């Protein structure tokens, strides 16, 4: 309990859509990053107060489970660097928009192999 919440609304609700230019982008070798904008603006339901992003491996032997990872909307764009992944690898993450009044569906389920090689400045 630190910031409360008014914007001529006295009651949250769950989005009824996933975020928008929902698309990966690979920045090192074990990280991709993970940019979207904010879900519609009548979807919206109110302000956000965070969404979840799921990704996992697109290989057989993975643990399987998305692995959420809880954030803050920082504004109307937000993006996420999942690292702790692969070299060279196919993965499939999701992107949703969660709020207190409860969570809305995944956006659709796009992917992005990572590169073939560390990072080099320049």
Do not use: C, H
Request: glycine share 12%; proline share 7%; no cysteine.
């Amino acid at each position: 309990g630190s910031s409360g919440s008014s914007g001529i609304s006295t009651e949250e609700a769950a989005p009824d859509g996933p975020p928008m230019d929902v698309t990966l982008q690979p920045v090192t070798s074990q990280s991709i990053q993970v940019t979207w904008k904010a879900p519609k603006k009548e979807l919206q339901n109110g302000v956000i107060r965070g969404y979840q992003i799921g990704y996992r491996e697109n290989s057989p032997g993975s643990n399987g489970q998305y692995s959420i990872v809880e954030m803050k909307a920082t504004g109307d764009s937000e993006v996420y660097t999942l690292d702790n992944l692969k070299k060279f690898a196919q993965y499939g993450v999701v992107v949703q928009a969660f709020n207190r009044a409860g969570t809305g569906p995944s956006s659709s389920e796009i992917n992005a192999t990572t590169l073939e090689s560390g990072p080099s400045s320049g």
